[PDB]
Coordinates of C-alpha atoms (C1' of nucleotides) and ligand atoms in Angstrom, one line a residue:
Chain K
X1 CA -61.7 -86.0 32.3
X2 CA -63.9 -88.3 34.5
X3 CA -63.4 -91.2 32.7
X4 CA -61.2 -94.4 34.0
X5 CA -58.4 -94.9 32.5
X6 CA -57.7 -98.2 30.7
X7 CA -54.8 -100.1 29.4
X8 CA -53.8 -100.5 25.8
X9 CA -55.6 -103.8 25.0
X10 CA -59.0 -102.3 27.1
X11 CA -58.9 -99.6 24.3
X12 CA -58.3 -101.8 21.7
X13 CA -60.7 -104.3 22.9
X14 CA -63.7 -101.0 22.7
X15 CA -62.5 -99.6 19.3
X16 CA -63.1 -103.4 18.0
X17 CA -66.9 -103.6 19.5
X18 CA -67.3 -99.7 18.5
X19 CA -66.2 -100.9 15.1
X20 CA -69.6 -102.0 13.7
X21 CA -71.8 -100.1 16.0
X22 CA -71.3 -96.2 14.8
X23 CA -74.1 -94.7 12.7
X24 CA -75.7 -91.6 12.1
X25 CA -78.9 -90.2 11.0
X26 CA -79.4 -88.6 8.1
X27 CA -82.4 -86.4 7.2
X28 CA -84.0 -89.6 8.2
X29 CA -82.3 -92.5 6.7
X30 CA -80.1 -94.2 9.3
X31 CA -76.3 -95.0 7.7
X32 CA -74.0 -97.4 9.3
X33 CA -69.9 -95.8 9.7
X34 CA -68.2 -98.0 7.9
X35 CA -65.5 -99.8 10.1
X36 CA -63.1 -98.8 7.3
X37 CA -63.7 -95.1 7.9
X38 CA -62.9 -94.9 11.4
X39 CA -59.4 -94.6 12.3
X40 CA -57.8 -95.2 16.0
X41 CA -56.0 -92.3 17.3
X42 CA -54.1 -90.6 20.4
X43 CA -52.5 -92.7 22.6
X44 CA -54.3 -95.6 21.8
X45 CA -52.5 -95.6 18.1
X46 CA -48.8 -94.9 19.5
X47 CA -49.5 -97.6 21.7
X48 CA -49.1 -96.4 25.3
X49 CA -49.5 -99.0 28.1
X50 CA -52.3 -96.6 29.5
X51 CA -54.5 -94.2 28.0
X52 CA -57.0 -91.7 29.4
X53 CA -59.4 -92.1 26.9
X54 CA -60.1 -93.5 23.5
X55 CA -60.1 -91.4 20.4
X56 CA -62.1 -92.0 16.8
X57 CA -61.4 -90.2 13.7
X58 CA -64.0 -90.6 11.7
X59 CA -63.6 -90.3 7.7
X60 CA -66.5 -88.7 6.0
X61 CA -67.3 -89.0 2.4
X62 CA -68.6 -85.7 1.3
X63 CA -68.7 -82.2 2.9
X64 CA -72.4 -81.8 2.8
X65 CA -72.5 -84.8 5.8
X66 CA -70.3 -83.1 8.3
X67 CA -73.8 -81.6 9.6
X68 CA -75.0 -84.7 10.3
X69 CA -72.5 -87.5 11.2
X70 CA -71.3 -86.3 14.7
X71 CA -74.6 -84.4 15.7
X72 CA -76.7 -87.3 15.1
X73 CA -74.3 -90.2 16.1
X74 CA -76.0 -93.4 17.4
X75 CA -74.1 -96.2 18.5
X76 CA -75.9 -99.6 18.5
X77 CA -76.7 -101.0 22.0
X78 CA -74.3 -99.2 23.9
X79 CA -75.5 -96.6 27.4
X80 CA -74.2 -93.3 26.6
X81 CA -74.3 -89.7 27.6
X82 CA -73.0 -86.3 25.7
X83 CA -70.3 -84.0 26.9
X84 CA -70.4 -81.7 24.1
X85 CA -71.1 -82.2 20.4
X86 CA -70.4 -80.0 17.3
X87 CA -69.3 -80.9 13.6
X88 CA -65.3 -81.6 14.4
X89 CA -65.3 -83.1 17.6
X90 CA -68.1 -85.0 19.8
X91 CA -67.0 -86.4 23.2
X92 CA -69.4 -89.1 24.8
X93 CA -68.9 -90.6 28.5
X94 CA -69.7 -94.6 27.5
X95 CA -70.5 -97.4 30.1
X96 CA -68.0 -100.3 29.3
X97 CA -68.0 -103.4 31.5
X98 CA -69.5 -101.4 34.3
X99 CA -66.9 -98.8 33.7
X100 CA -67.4 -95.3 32.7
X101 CA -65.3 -94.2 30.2
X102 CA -64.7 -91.1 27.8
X103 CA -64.7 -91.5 24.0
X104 CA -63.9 -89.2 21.6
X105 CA -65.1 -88.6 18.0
X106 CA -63.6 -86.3 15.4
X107 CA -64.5 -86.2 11.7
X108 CA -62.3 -85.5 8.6
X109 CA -63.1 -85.3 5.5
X110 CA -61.4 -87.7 3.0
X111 CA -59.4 -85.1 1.3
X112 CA -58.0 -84.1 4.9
X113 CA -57.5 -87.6 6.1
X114 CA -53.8 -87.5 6.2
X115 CA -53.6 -83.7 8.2
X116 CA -56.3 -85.1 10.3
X117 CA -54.6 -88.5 11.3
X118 CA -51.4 -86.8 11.3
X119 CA -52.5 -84.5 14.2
X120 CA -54.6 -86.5 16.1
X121 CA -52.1 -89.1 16.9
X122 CA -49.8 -86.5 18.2
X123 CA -48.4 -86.5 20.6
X124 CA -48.8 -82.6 21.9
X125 CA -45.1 -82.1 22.4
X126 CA -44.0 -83.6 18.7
X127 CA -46.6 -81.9 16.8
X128 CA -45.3 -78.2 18.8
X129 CA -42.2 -79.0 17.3
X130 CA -43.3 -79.9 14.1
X131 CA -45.7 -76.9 12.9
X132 CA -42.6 -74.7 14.5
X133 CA -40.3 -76.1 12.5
X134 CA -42.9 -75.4 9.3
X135 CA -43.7 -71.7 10.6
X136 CA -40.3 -70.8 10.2
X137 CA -40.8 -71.7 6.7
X138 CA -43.8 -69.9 6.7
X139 CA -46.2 -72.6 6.6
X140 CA -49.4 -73.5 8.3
X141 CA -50.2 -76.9 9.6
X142 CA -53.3 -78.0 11.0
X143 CA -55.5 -80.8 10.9
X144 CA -57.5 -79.6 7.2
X145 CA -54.0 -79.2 5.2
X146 CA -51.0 -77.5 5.0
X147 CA -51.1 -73.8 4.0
X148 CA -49.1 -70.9 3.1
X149 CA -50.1 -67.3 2.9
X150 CA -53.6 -68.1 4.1
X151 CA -53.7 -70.6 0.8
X152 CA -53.8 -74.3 0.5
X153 CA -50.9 -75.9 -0.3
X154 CA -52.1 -78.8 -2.7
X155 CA -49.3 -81.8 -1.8
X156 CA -49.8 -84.6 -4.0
X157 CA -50.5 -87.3 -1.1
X158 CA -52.3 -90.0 0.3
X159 CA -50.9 -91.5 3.2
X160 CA -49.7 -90.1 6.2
X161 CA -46.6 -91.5 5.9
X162 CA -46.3 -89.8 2.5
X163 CA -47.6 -86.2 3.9
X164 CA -44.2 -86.4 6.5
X165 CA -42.1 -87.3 4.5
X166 CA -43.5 -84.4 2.0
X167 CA -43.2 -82.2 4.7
X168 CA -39.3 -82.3 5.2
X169 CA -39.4 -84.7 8.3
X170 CA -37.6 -87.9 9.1
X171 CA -41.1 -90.6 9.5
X172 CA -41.8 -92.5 12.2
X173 CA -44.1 -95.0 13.7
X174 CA -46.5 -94.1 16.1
X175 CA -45.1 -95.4 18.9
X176 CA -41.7 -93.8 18.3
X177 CA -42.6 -89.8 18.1
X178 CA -42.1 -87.9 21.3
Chain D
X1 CA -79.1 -58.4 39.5
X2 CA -80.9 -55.5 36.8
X3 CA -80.3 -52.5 37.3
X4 CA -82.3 -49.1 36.5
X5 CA -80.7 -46.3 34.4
X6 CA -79.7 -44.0 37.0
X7 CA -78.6 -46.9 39.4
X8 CA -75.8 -47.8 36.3
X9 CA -74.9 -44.6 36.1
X10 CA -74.2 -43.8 39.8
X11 CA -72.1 -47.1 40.2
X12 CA -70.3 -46.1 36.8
X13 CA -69.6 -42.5 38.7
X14 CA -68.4 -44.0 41.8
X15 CA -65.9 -46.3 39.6
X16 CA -64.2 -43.4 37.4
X17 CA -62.5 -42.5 39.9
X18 CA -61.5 -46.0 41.5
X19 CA -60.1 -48.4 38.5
X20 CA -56.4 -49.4 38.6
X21 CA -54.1 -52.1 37.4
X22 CA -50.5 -53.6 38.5
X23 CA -47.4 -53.3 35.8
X24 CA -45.2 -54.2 39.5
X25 CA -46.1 -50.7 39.6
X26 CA -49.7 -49.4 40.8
X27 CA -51.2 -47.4 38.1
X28 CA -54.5 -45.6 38.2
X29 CA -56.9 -45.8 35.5
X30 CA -58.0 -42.3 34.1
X31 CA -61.7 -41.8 34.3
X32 CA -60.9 -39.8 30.5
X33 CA -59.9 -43.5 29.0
X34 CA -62.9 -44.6 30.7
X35 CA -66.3 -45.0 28.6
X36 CA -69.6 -46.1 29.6
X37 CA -70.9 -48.3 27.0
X38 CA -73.7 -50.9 26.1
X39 CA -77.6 -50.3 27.1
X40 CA -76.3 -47.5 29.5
X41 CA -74.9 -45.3 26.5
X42 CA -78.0 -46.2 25.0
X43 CA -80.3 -45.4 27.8
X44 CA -82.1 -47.6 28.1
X45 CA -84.3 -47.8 31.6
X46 CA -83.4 -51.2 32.7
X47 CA -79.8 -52.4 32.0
X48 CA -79.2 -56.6 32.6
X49 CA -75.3 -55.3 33.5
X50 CA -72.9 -52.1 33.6
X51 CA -70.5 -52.0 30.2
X52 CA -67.4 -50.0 30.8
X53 CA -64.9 -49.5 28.1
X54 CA -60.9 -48.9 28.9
X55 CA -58.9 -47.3 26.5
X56 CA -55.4 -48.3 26.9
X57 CA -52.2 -46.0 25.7
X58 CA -50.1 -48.6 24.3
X59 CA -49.8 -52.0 23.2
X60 CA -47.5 -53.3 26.0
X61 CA -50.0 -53.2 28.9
X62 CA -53.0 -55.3 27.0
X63 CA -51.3 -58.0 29.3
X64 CA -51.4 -56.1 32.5
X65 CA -54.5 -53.6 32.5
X66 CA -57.3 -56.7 33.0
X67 CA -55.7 -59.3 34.0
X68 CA -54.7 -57.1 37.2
X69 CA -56.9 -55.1 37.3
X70 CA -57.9 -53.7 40.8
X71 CA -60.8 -51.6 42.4
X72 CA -60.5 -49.5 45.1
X73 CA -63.3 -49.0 47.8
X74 CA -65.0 -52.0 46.1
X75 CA -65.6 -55.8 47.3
X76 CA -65.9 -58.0 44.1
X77 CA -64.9 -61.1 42.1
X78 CA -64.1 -62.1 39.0
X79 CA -66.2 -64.4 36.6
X80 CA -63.4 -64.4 33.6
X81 CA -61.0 -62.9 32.4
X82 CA -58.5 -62.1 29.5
X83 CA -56.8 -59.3 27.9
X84 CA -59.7 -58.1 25.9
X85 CA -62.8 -59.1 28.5
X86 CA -62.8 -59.2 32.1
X87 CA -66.3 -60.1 33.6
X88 CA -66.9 -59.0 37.6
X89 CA -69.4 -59.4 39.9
X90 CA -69.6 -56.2 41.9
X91 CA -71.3 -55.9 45.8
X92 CA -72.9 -52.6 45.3
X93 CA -75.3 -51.4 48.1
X94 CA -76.8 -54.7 49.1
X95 CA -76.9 -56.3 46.0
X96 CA -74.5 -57.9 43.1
X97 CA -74.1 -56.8 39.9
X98 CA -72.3 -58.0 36.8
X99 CA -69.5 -55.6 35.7
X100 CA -68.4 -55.7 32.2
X101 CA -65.0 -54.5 31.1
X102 CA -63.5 -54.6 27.9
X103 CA -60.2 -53.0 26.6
X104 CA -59.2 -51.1 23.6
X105 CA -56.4 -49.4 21.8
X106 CA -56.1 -45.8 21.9
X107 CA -55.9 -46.3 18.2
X108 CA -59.2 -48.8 18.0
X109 CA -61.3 -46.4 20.2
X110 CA -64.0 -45.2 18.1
X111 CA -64.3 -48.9 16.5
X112 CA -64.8 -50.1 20.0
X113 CA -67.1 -47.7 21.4
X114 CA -69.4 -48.5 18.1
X115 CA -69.1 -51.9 18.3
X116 CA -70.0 -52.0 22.2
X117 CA -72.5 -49.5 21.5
X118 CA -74.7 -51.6 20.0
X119 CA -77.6 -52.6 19.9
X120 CA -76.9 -55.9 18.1
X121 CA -79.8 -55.6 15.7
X122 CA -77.9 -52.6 14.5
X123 CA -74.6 -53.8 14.2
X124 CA -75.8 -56.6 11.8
X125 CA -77.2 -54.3 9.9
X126 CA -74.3 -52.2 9.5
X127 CA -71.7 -54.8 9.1
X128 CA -73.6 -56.8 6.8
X129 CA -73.7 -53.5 4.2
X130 CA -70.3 -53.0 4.3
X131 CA -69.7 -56.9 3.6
X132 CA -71.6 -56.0 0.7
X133 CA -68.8 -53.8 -0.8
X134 CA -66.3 -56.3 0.5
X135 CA -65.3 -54.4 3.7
X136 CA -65.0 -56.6 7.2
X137 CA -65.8 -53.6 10.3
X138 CA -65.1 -55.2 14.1
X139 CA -64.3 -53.7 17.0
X140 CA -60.5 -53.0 15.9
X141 CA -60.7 -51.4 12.9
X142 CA -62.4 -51.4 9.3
X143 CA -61.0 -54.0 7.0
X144 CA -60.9 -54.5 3.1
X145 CA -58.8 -57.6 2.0
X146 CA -57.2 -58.8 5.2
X147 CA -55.6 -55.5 5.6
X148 CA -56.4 -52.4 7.8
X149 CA -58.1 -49.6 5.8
X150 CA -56.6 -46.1 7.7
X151 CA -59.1 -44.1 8.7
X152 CA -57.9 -40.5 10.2
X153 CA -60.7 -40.2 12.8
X154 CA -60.8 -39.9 16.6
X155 CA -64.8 -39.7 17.5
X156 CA -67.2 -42.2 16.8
X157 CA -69.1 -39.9 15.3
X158 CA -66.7 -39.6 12.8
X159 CA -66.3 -43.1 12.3
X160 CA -70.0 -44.0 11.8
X161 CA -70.5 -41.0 8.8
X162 CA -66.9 -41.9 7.0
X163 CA -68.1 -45.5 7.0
X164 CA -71.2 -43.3 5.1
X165 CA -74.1 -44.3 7.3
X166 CA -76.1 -41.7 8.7
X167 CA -75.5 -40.9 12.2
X168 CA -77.9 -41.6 15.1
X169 CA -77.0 -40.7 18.8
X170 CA -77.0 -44.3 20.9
X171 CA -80.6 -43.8 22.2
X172 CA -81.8 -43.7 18.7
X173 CA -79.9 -46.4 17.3
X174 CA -82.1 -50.0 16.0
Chain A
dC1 C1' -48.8 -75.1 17.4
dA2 C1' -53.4 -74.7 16.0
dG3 C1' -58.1 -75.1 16.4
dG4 C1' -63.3 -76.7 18.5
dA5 C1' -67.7 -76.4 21.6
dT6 C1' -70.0 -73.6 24.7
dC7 C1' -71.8 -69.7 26.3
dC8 C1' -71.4 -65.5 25.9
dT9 C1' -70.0 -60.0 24.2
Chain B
dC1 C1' -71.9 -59.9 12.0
dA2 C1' -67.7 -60.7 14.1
dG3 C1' -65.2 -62.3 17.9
dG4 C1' -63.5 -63.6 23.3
dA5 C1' -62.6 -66.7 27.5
dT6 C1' -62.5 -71.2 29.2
dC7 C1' -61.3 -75.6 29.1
dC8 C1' -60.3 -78.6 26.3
dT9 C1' -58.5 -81.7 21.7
Ligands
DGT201 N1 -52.0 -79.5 17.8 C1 -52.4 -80.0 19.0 N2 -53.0 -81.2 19.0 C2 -53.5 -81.7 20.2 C3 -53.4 -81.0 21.4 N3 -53.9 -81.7 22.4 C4 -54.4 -82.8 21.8 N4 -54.1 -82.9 20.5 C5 -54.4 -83.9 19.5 C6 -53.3 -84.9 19.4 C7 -53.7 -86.0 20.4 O1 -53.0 -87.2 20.3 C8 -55.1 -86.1 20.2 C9 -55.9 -86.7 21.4 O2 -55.7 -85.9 22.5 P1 -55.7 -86.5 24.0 O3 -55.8 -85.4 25.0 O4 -56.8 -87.6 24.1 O5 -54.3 -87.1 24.2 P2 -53.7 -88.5 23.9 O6 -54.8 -89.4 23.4 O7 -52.5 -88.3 23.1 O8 -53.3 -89.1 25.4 P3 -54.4 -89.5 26.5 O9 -55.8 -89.5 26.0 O10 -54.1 -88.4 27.5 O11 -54.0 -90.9 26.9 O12 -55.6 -84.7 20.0 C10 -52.7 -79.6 21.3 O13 -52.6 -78.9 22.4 N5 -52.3 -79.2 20.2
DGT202 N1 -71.0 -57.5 16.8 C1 -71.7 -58.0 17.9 N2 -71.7 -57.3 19.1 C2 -72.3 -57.7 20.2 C3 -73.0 -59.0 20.2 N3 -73.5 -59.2 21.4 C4 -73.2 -58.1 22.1 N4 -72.4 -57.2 21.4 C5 -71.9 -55.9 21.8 C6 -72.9 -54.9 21.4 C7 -73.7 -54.7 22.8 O1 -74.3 -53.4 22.8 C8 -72.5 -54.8 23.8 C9 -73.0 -55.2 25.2 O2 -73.7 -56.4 25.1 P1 -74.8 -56.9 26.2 O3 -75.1 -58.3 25.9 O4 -74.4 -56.4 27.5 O5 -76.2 -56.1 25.7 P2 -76.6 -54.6 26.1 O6 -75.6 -54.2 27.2 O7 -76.8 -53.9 24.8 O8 -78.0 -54.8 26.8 P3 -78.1 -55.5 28.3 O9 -76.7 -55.6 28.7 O10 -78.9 -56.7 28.0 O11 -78.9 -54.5 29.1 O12 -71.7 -55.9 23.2 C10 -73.0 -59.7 18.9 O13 -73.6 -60.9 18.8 N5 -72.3 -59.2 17.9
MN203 MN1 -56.7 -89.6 24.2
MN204 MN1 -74.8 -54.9 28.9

DNA sequence: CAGGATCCT
DNA sequence: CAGGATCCT
């Protein structure tokens, strides 16, 4: 909200430096976010020229860490205050090059990693259309999976890519939805 | 501001007769679909706000009966509101008070009035029980299964002894 | 469309 | 225990 907007390569420029830096506390021991399990998301993935913030998705291994990652996020050698901070979504205010900025985490688990990348790219008025489209089907979307009947509906996929295309939809880049 | 027992239940008096909402039509609020609720149903001798209850006929005027809602003879202003809860902060002889409304269904009634009853302790109590046989109570209806379990009762009193818990008036209730 | 964190009810 | 309003995401 606060935060200063930046242009695409600004963004890109943080996620890079953010890339080695995220770790989290747990019951104690101190475990490093692999680079590998943080994806770049919103704007900054469909590549708009200017963004309004920068947004994580962080992949977790196992359920039982969700407790932990977000609510006891450190980030190496970077000044940083809280906005608010639960399991799903933790949004920081971060001093960049003299800048304040707002950055915001979200966590998935690795079996929702598609549903979670899927929505959190967006954007707002693509994904509307999207979970429409599914409702009159009687589907669910979200970002935990795709449902039916209050019951998971257990696609056999991996990828994003694969979960639109398994959803009935015509895939494209990130740059291209609208 | 707190409030003593009989100061709740003189401003509750005064607004019986004085709730109304717009909708392009003005209509008034009857002070029958009008129930006191929380700490001051349970009198209790210091209240931290006033709880009223409105019981609305049908279905169609959850969006109008809160979100324009109005008060006659009464300066005030709203803290939030929705459909279900609208929060106001009341002038009443020189002080401010918090004003609580919340709506219900004339069909919900006597689930409301339980669940804003209170006190919490109770309601945890009560609700955890029937979770025990696999029922879900709120302030709506009793539930078993995702679906709504029809009950042919008006009262609350009713309510509480076909849920099959013995009934206590509110200033007994813990 | 769908859901999350906060601070309540 | 179960859920609402606000302002986000
Ligand atoms: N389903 C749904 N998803 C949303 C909504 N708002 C945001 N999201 C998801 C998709 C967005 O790409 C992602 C990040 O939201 P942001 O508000 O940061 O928007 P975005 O990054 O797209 O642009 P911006 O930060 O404004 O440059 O969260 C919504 O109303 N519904
Ligand atoms: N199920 C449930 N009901 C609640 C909860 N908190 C409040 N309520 C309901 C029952 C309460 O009697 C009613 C009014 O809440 P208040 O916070 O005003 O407390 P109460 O009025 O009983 O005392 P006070 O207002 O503090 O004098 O709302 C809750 O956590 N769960
Ligand atoms: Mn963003
Ligand atoms: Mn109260």
């Amino acid at each position: 909200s606060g935060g200063g907007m930046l242009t695409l390569i600004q963004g890109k420029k943080i996620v890079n430096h953010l890339r080695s830096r995220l770790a989290f506390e747990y019951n104690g021991q101190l475990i490093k976010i692999l680079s590998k399990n943080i994806v770049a998301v919103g704007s900054l993935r469909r590549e708009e020229k200017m963004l309004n913030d920068v947004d994580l998705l962080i992949i977790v291994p196992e359920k039982k860490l969700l407790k932990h990652v977000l609510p006891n996020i450190r980030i190496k050698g970077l000044s940083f205050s809280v906005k608010v901070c639960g399991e799903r979504k933790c949004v920081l205010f971060i001093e960049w090059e003299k800048k304040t900025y707002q950055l915001d985490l979200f966590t998935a688990l690795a079996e929702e990693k598609p549903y979670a990348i899927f929505h959190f790219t967006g954007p707002v008025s693509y994904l509307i259309r999207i979970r429409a489209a599914l409702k009159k089907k009687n589907y669910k979307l979200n970002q935990y999976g795709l449902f039916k009947n209050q019951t998971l509906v257990p696609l056999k996929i991996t990828t994003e890519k694969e979960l639109i295309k398994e959803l009935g939809f015509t895939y494209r880049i990130p740059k291209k939805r609208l």
